[PDB]
C-alpha cells in the first residue's frame, strides 16, 4: 500500500551503501577549476545519482501505481533530486500511459531552512503558505538529505495540521551520523558516511550547489566560506 507512517520507512527498500572509504579522486572526474581546492574528494558521481534516482522513480511508481499523489519539494537543496525525479517519473508513467490514463502527480514547493555552516541551528523556518490544497491528498515529500532528522521530523509534524490523507518520504541521501534522530524515509537513494557533502544542489552557505557531483568540502572551504 501507499506509505503513511512518516519517519518510520516501514517498507523502505535498502539504499545504495556508500562505504566509509568509498569515493574518487577529484582528478578522475570533471570538477570546476576553482572548487578543486575546497573539496577533498568525489563521494558519489553525478551519473550514479541520476541512475539511482531513476530507480527510485520506478520504486515510487510501483508503490503508487495510478494513484494520484502530490510531490512536495523541500527547497532549495532538494532541486537536483526533484528535477531528475520528475523527469524519470514522468517518462515511466507516460511510457506506460494509455489513452484512458490520467496524470500521476501534482507538484509543490516549500522553502525550509535550518543550517548555518555545516550544522543545524536546531530551528526550522518554513516559508508560510496555505497548504489546504493538499487536504485529503497523498503527499510525497522530496528531500535531499536526512542528517540529524530535525527538518523532516519537524516538517512532518507541521504537515499534520493540514489534514493530508497520506504522507510519504523520498530522500536522496541519508547520513550515518550519531546525531541522527531515527527518522527514516520510505524511498532512499544513498546511505553515506558522516561528512558534510556539497554538490547536486546541496550547499555550504549557498556555495557548491552547481557542483555536479556529491563531494566532501574540506576544512579550507568550510573556513573560507564560513558564515
Amino acid at each position: 500500500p501507499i506509505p503513511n507512517n512518516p519517519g518510520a520507512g516501514e517498507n523502505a527498500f535498502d539504499p545504495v551503501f556508500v562505504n566509509d572509504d568509498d569515493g574518487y579522486d577529484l582528478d578522475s572526474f570533471m570538477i570546476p577549476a576553482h572548487y578543486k581546492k575546497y573539496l577533498t574528494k568525489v563521494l558519489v558521481p553525478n551519473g550514479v545519482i541520476k541512475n539511482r534516482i531513476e530507480k527510485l522513480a520506478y520504486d515510487i511508481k510501483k508503490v503508487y501505481n495510478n494513484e494520484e499523489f502530490h510531490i512536495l519539494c523541500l527547497l532549495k537543496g532538494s532541486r537536483g533530486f526533484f528535477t531528475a525525479l520528475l523527469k524519470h517519473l514522468s517518462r515511466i508513467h507516460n511510457y506506460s500511459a494509455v489513452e484512458t490514463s490520467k496524470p500521476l502527480f501534482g507538484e509543490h514547493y516549500v522553502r525550509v531552512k535550518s543550517y548555518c555552516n555545516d550544522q543545524s541551528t536546531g530551528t526550522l523556518e518554513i516559508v508560510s503558505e496555505d497548504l489546504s490544497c493538499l487536504k485529503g491528498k497523498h503527499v510525497l515529500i522530496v528531500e535531499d538529505i536526512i542528517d540529524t532528522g530535525k527538518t523532516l521530523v519537524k516538517f512532518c509534524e507541521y504537515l499534520k495540521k493540514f489534514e493530508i490523507k497520506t504522507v510519504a518520504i523520498a530522500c536522496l541521501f541519508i547520513k550515518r551520523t550519531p546525531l541522527w534522530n531515527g527518522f527514516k524515509a520510505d524511498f532512499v537513494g544513498f546511505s553515506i558516511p558522516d561528512h558534510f557533502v556539497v554538490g547536486y544542489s546541496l550547499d555550504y552557505n549557498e556555495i557548491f550547489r552547481d557542483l555536479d557531483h556529491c563531494c566532501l568540502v574540506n576544512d579550507e572551504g568550510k573556513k573560507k566560506y564560513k558564515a
Copy 2:
C-alpha cells in the same frame, strides 16, 4: 553592461520567431496517450526549447561575464525553463572557469499566481523567502512566459522596495497578444502566436506541466479542466 531597466529590454537580442501557423502534428512526436485528445498540436518541441535555452544561457553569461548575480525563479510555470537554464549556465561557466574563478550565481524562488483557466484574474499573489536578501544584488528574473505583462510589471514594481542593485528579465516565451502591456524581457527565447500554451511546466489549471513539448490546448481540454 548588465541590464537595469525592467520592462524595457533595452538591449535584448531577438527571439526565435514562431510563425502564426508554425507547429507539428501530434503524431510526429512523443505525446502522453491521455493528453492527445486535449491538444490541437505541438507548437515548439522540447528539443528546440532546450537548444534555445542553451544559447540564452550563453547570452546571459556573455552579459554578466563573472559578475555574481542571483537568479529568481518565478514558480510554478518557469521550473522547466529554470532548471534547463541552470544546467547550461553552470556548464558554460564551469567549462571556462579557472583555478582563480568564483561561482557565478545564487538561486531563489518566488511563487507568483494570477491565472485561472486561460486568463489572468487581473490579480497577483506572492509567496517567498524574505526578498530583502536581494539588497545590493544583481538579480536575474527567470520567467516562463510574458502574456499581458501584468505579472512581471507588478512583481518588478514590488521588487523596488528592497534596494536591489540591478533587475533583468529572462523569459522563455513572449506571446503576440493584443493584451500585451508592453513589458519586454532582456533575454527572450521565443515569440509565439496568440494561443494558450501548455507543457514544459506551463499549465492549464495545474494540468500538462509534465507534457514535454510546448503545445496548444484545444477547446475540449479547456472545457474538461475548467475550474
Copy 3:
C-alpha cells in the same frame, strides 16, 4: 506487418515536413564559432531531430513488436541517427520488457561511399563484415538521408544475394529534389527542401560531422572545402 518492399515504403507514416523557407538564424542557437561563416542557417535544430527520432523508434518498436531484427548502420553519415535510435529503441523496449522478454535487436555496420563535394559521383563503394550473417534475418537499414536514391536502391539490390528474410528502411531525412529516383523509406524523420545539408553526422567532404544541428552550408563553405 514487418515491411518487406525496399523502396516502396508501402505503409510509411508521413514525416515532419520542413517547408522550403523553414529554418532559424544562426545566432538563435549554439554554433561552433569557426563554422558560422560557412553556414547560411539552421534548418533543423539538434533537439527536434532527437525528439523525432524518439517517435521513430516508437514507430519501429510498434511495427516489430518483439520480433528480433538486425539494424544495419550505413556509415558514416548515419552515426548520429543510429546512436540516437538505439538509445530510444532500447529504453522503449526495456521499459516495457518483462522477465520472460528477450533482446530486440542486433547491430551491424556497413560503410557506403558515393559523394564528392555536394553531388553523387554516380558510383558506390562498400566495406563491411560478411553480410551473409544476415541470412534469414529481419534487417532494418538505418540511413541518414535519401537524396537521389542511388545509395539505397543500389545497396538494397546488393542485399538480395544474401537471402535476408525482410528488408526495411529507416531514414532521418528525405530531400525534395528533382533528382530523386523514387526510393521511399518505411520510416522517415523529416522531408526537407532541396539544399545540401550538414551536421548531425552529415558532412561536406568530411567536414561538419560534429555540428549539432542540421544546417545549410553556404557557397563559401562549399568552396573552402571543395575536394
Copy 4:
C-alpha cells in the same frame, strides 16, 4: 607531447580503480527485466561511465590541444564509449573554439573480431579497408576494453604498415587478468576486476550490448547464450 608508443602508455593518467569487491545490487538500478537472471551484479553504472568518459575527453583535448587527429573506433563493443567520447570531445573543443579555430578530429571505423563466448580465439579478423587516408596522421584508437591485450597488440602492428604519423590509445576499461600481455593505453577509464563484463556496448555473443550499465554476466547467462 602527443603519445606515440602504442602499448606503453608512457604518460597515462591513472584510471578509476574498481576494487575486486566493488559493485551494486541489480535492484539498486534500472535493469531490463529479462536480463536480471543472467547477471550477478552491476560493476560500473552507466552514469559513472559517462562522467568518466567526459574527463577522458578533457584529458585528450589537453594532450592534443588544437592538433588535428583522427579517431579510429574499434567496432563494435567500442560504440558506447565512442559515442559519449565524441559528444564530450566536440562540446569541449567547440565551447572553447574561436572564429579562427578549426575542427579537431576526423572519425573512422574498423571492425575487429576475436572473441567467442568469454574467451579470445587467439586470432583477429580485421575487416579490410584502405587506411591510406591516415598516412601521416595522428590517430587515436578508441577501444572498449583491454583484456589479454591481443586485439590492440595485433591491431597496432597492423596499423604500422600504413605510415601513420602517430598512434595513441584511448580505452574505456582495462581488466586485471593474469592473461594480460602488458599492453597499456594512453587514456584509460577504469581498471576492473577479472570478470567478463557486458553492457555499454560490450557483449557476450552479441547479447547485452543494449544493457546501460557495465555488469557481470553469470554462469547461467554464459551457458544460456554459449556459442
